[PDB]
Amino acid sequence: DYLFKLLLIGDSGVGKTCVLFRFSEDAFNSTFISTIGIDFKIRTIELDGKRIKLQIWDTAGQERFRTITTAYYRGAMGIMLVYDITNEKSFDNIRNWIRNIEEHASADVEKMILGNKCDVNDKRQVSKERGEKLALDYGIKFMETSAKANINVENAFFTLARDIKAKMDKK
Numbered sequence: 001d002y003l004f005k006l007l008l009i010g011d012s013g014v015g016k017t018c019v020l021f022r023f024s025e026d027a028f029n030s031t032f033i034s035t036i037g038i039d040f041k042i043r044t045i046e047l048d049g050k051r052i053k054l055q056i057w058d059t060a061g062q063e064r065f066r067t068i069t070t071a072y073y074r075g076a077m078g079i080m081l082v083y084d085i086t087n088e089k090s091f092d093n094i095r096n097w098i099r100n101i102e103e104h105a106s107a108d109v110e111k112m113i114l115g116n117k118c119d120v121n122d123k124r125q126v127s128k129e130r131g132e133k134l135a136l137d138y139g140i141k142f143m144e145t146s147a148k149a150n151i152n153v154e155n156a157f158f159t160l161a162r163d164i165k166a167k168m169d170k171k
């Protein structure tokens, strides 16, 4: 009977919605419809024999109201910071995203970096080593993911949930 509120953040087009759609619905769609408003999906997993309800919030990387939507960080217990390995800009922007988390989220929020679209290695711009190094510099975890090929999607969410649970259980 745990309830963990998670938030996906990162530039438009990196695959936040698709990563969640794989996790929650076990499917992949190649269409790109930028996310409208803010909403969640629910999936309950089991850790250490306990039921962990994950309420995972998704909103657009839309720039227009980005200064206002920093409001959303406050309620997050864990945050996935997503970039696209085929898009250097999305990775360059992770620094700015992490500063927003530090400014607006709880100091103890759990954070993970996802380098998504790792199935499109033929268009890779960001080396895995650079993603690993960025994560190293902030002391947080890193995975390359693919919503399409179903690479590390379960792993990412279970790992983030396990880290939230471990901190919580130390009370």
Ligand SMILES: Nc1nc2c(ncn2[C@@H]2O[C@H](COP(=O)(O)OP(=O)(O)NP(=O)(O)O)[C@@H](O)[C@H]2O)c(=O)[nH]1
Pocket: 010, 011, 012, 013, 014, 015, 016, 017, 018, 019, 029, 030, 031, 032, 033, 034, 035, 036, 059, 060, 061, 062, 116, 117, 118, 119, 120, 145, 146, 147, 148, 149
């Ligand atoms: N090849 C491949 N394409 C992916 C992957 N994940 C997402 N995409 C594609 O990338 C595009 C953007 O995905 P989407 O999930 O909408 O991105 P988003 O980060 O939610 N965008 P927004 O912030 O505007 O809502 C879509 O065409 C989608 O199919 C992936 O793992 N592999």
Ligand SMILES: [Mg+2]
Pocket: 016, 017, 018, 033, 034, 035, 058, 059, 060, 061
């Ligand atoms: Mg989206």
